[PDB]
Amino acid sequence: AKLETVTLGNIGKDGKQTLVLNPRGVNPTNGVASLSQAGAVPALEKRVTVSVSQPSRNRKNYKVQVKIQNPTACTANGSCDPSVTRQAYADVTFSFTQYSTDEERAFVRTELAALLASPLLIDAIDQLNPAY
Amino acid sequence: AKLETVTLGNIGKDGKQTLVLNPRGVNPTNGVASLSQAGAVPALEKRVTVSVSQPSRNRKNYKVQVKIQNPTACTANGSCDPSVTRQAYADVTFSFTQYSTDEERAFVRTELAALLASPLLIDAIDQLNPAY
Amino acid sequence: AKLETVTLGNIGKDGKQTLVLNPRGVNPTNGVASLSQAGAVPALEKRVTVSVSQPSRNRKNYKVQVKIQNPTACTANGSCDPSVTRQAYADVTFSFTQYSTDEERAFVRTELAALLASPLLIDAIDQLNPAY
Amino acid sequence: AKLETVTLGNIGKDGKQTLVLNPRGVNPTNGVASLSQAGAVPALEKRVTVSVSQPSRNRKNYKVQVKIQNPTACTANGSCDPSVTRQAYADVTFSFTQYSTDEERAFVRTELAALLASPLLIDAIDQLNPAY
Amino acid sequence: AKLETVTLGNIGKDGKQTLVLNPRGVNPTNGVASLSQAGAVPALEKRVTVSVSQPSRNRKNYKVQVKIQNPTACTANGSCDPSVTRQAYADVTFSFTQYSTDEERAFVRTELAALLASPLLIDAIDQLNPAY
Amino acid sequence: AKLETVTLGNIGKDGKQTLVLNPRGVNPTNGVASLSQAGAVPALEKRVTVSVSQPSRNRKNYKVQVKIQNPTACTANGSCDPSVTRQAYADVTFSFTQYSTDEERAFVRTELAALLASPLLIDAIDQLNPAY
């Protein structure tokens, strides 16, 4: 699409947070758009990436994949600038036949958005206990 | 969580559709919960799967992964029972340090759900045109 | 150029048809812009692609190449969504020395456009009989 | 068709030039028609060539291809007769199924002629800047 | 940034010249933006290029590099269109840790700009004699 | 030139800082002049270096290159003297034919200084986002 500044609301465990992702570049040799929460230092800011890839005689399917990467920082022992002490990642990969309709594709996008909101996925992701 | 019958609403290109996923089994040797829209014949019904997996000395990270799979069917040439004529898949994989807080995990989950609703991701998925 | 939505008229055997090509992305790893007649399903829509490529120590010449690809579809045997039952392609490849003037290049472009309108090229492409 | 003398008008950067291509032969071992602006010396005259080639069990497709070759000359250093000091080439290759209709072929030819007049294709060829 | 038309003033040995660099394209397979003083023939025009490159598990540092390339042309012996008879190149490469602040980067940028105005660098570049 | 103490003003993100570089030596086996902001401890001070190199039957071109190296120090972990916890480097490399005029070289030098002040390069170096 148009590589706007995308800004998500009603985010978080709260239900009441927000994230502004400014469009920190497009192509990096490898056809991947890129966004990131304007932060103190490059190493420290949340990120997202989106890429679509037309089918090449090799893999015959359209393939969209999104990636989230949130670093967390600690002003580690008595030092100065903070250190990244772990990262939480997420990435989806959609796969669609050349012959799929946009109604089909849109259903999959929205089905996953609804599924992430479900009580089952909340205990799978928030609480990390499995499903019995 | 508890392996309920999950029912997603406000789904679809419309914004006004709904999906009931009935809990068609749990463990299949490989720790994967499993649901499916009760449909005419096995081969023909929407699916989802959920798995979280504790870190084992090998991979040190908790890893949650969801998978969507929607067959689309055609009452193919002058025959009887319909055939699957293509499938649209999606799958996410969350990755969290052993040392991450649920606020972090829940934030990643909700950011992805909000991002799937954003205008940028809609053109990537529904319309498959990339980001410029 | 600016990746506008290009809209060609007075097209066709008629001389009286029109084609709107909406700019379905730019870079796909391999510097190829891309347009497409917004159509029912990905596999089914007309396309064009444009690429220029500066000379790199290897090939000393600027090289422009455009590509046309029109699928033609049949609601084949008593099924549903139609199948692509053939494609007609065309592609030009312009080659210009680093030392060429734009008048030189523009002449070649317009000569080829004029040549495609000529009686000789019409029997070569439309009617497929050669030239005697 | 008939290997007439073809004469292209409204050519050039101007829009107001013309090219007379006189039919300097047909077959040269390899079924290639051939034209040339009657010029001072063989090496110095603009050319075009046309070939169609019936499908042979090898390649199952009819294949038409046209080739432009315009040499540019300089009465280089205080000498006599001019030299070719570069060439600008263009060539198309059409590819059509045995099962294609002339309407299909004609649409491709006219689409390509229309496309060479478009503003986007002008910056790729005349100004050589790519598409963003 | 936005790939504007950059126009540098107070340039040159004089201190009193100006250079218009028009944005002749962006990506050419390898993520390199590109500008050039619109000149007679491609081979003959001044150029500049800019690239940033996110660190990839390989090289852990952000790396920005700018490149200048000015051909000089001679209406070479008794000919026509001139030939390029030498080029003067310059290229910078900035290298920054992921954990650097923009104040740090801005300091290096402005330090290098001030340093090119200094009396010492002028005898190194303009006059090519070393430092004693 | 004469290896003066160079002192750059109007430096920095501010535009309103200054840097004194005192001439801490010349030759170190490999013909490299050398300067540095007098700082607490060797490991901790800003640097610059300049070299010209006459062309030797090998590389036929004069080649001037400047290098910036700014360490950043943190009175890290409840210790004493600080440690260098990252460095920001920059280096240019000018390359001139034996047959270049100093006006050409001076133009490249001043062209690169103006270019570091331009709005485009500022977003490349300070903000690290590329050009679109």
CATH classification of the domain holding F79? 3.30.380.10
- How many angstroms is the resolution? 3.5
- Residue D3: φ, ψ to 5°: -75, 65
- Residue C62: φ, ψ to 5°: -60, 145
Chain A residue with the nearest C-alpha to that of B111: A11
* Antiparallel, parallel or unpaired: β E17-21 and F33-36: unpaired
Q: Say whether residue E79 is in contact with chain F using an 8 A CB cutoff.
A: no
What is the spatial distance between Cα D106 and Cα D112, in angstroms, rounded to a whole number? 10
Contact call for C and D: 3+ CB–CB distances under 8 Å: yes
Which residues in chain E are contacts of F48 at CB distance < 8 A? 111, 115
- How many CB atoms within 10 Å of residue C80? 17
Q: Shortest CA distance to C13 belongs to which of D99, D2, D113, D4?
A: D113
Contact call for B and E: 3+ CB–CB distances under 8 Å: no
Record: contact E81-D75, CB cut-off 8 A: no
Chain E residue with the nearest C-alpha to that of A25: E1
- How many CB atoms within 10 Å of residue C65? 18
- How many CB atoms within 10 Å of residue C40? 13
What 8-state DSSP symbol labels residue C103? H
Helix-then-strand count for chain D, H and E: 2, 6
What is the spatial distance between Cα B123 and Cα A2, in angstroms, rounded to a whole number? 9
Longest Cα separation, chain E: 58
Following CA atoms C6, C9, C14, C16 in sequence, which dihedral angle do they give, to the nearest 10 degrees? 140
Contact B110, A113 (CB under 8 A): no
Record: contact E80-D78, CB cut-off 8 A: no
Q: Which residues pair with A83 in a beta bridge?
A: A74
Contact D94, D63 (CB under 8 A): yes
Half-sphere exposure of B65 (CA within 13 A, CB side): 15
Record: contact F132-A24, CB cut-off 8 A: no
Chain A residue with the nearest C-alpha to that of E2: A25
- How many CB atoms within 10 Å of residue D29? 5
A132 CB-contact burial (10 Å; exposed 0-12 / middle 13-18 / buried 19+): exposed
Q: Both tokens of residue A118?
A: 């479900």
| Helical segments of chain E, H only | 102-117, 119-125
State the nearest Cα–Cα gap between D130 and chain E, in angstroms. 6
Q: Report F:18-47 residues touching E (Cβ under 8 A).
A: 19, 26, 31, 33, 46
What is the spatial distance between Cα A88 and Cα A73, in angstroms, rounded to a whole number? 12
Q: How many structural domains comprise chain A?
A: 1
What is the spatial distance between Cα D8 and Cα D46, in angstroms, rounded to a whole number? 13
Q: Report yes or no on E48 lying in a domain.
A: yes
| Helical segments of C58-130, H only | 102-117, 119-125
E43: three-class secondary structure by DSSP: helix
What is the spatial distance between Cα A87 and Cα B95, in angstroms, rounded to a whole number? 8
Q: Shortest CA distance to E31 belongs to which of E5, E60, E3, E61?
A: E3
Contacts of residue F89, defined as CB under 8 A and 6 or more positions apart, other chains included, come to: E94, E95, E108, F67, F68, F69, F70
Q: Report yes or no on D1 lying in a domain.
A: no
- Residue B100: φ, ψ to 5°: -85, 145
Contact C106, D60 (CB under 8 A): no
What is the spatial distance between Cα D84 and Cα D68, in angstroms, rounded to a whole number? 16
A42: three-class secondary structure by DSSP: helix
B34: three-class secondary structure by DSSP: strand
Breaks (C-N over 2.5 A) in chain D follow: none
Q: Shortest CA distance to E71 belongs to which of C56, D126, F100?
A: F100
B15: three-class secondary structure by DSSP: coil
Contact D90, C93 (CB under 8 A): yes
Radius of gyration of chain F, Cα coordinates, nearest whole angstrom: 18
Please report all neighbours of B, defined by 3+ CB atom pairs within 8 A: A, C
C82 to each of A121, C70, C74, F2, F30, how far by Cα in Å? 37, 15, 5, 80, 72
Q: Which residues pair with E97 in a beta bridge?
A: E61
State the nearest Cα–Cα gap between B103 and chain A, in angstroms. 6
Q: Which residues of E106-123 are buried (b: 16+ CB within 10 A; e: fewer)?
A: bbbbbbbbbbbebebbbb
* Antiparallel, parallel or unpaired: β F62-74 and E47-53: unpaired
Taking 3-state DSSP, the helix, strand and coil percentages for chain D, each rounded to the nearest 5, stand at 20, 40, 40
Domain enclosing residue C44, as ranges: 6-127
What 8-state DSSP symbol labels residue C45? S
B3: three-class secondary structure by DSSP: coil
Q: Report yes or no on B36 lying in a domain.
A: yes
Q: Say whether residue E84 is in contact with chain F using an 8 A CB cutoff.
A: no
B80 CB-contact burial (10 Å; exposed 0-12 / middle 13-18 / buried 19+): exposed
What's the residue count for chain A?
Answer: 132
Which residues in chain F are contacts of A5 at CB distance < 8 A? none
Q: Report yes or no on C114 lying in a domain.
A: yes
Q: Report yes or no on A12 lying in a domain.
A: yes
Q: Which residues of F3-33 are buried (b: 16+ CB within 10 A; e: fewer)?
A: beebebeebbbeeeeebebebeeeeeeeebb
Q: Report yes or no on D20 lying in a domain.
A: yes
What is the spatial distance between Cα B22 and Cα B25, in angstroms, rounded to a whole number? 9
Q: Which amino acid, one-letter code, is at C7?
A: T
Contact F129, F123 (CB under 8 A): yes
Contacts of residue F124, defined as CB under 8 A and 6 or more positions apart, other chains included, come to: E1, E50, E52, E64, E66, F130, F131
Q: Both tokens of residue E118?
A: 């200094």
Q: Say whether residue C16 is in contact with chain D using an 8 A CB cutoff.
A: no
Q: Report yes or no on B74 lying in a domain.
A: yes
Q: Shortest CB distance from C27 goes to which of E27, E41, E43? A: E27
Chain A residue with the nearest C-alpha to that of E60: A43
Chain A residue with the nearest C-alpha to that of B110: A11
Q: Report yes or no on C1 lying in a domain.
A: no
Q: Shortest CB distance from E30 goes to which of A29, A40, A42? A: A29
D8 to each of A48, C66, C112, D38, how far by Cα in Å? 54, 22, 9, 14
| Helical segments of B9-118, H only | 102-117
Which residues in chain A are contacts of F126 at CB distance < 8 A? none
Solving technique: X-ray
What is the spatial distance between Cα C71 and Cα C56, in angstroms, rounded to a whole number? 34
What is the spatial distance between Cα D68 and Cα D46, in angstroms, rounded to a whole number? 8
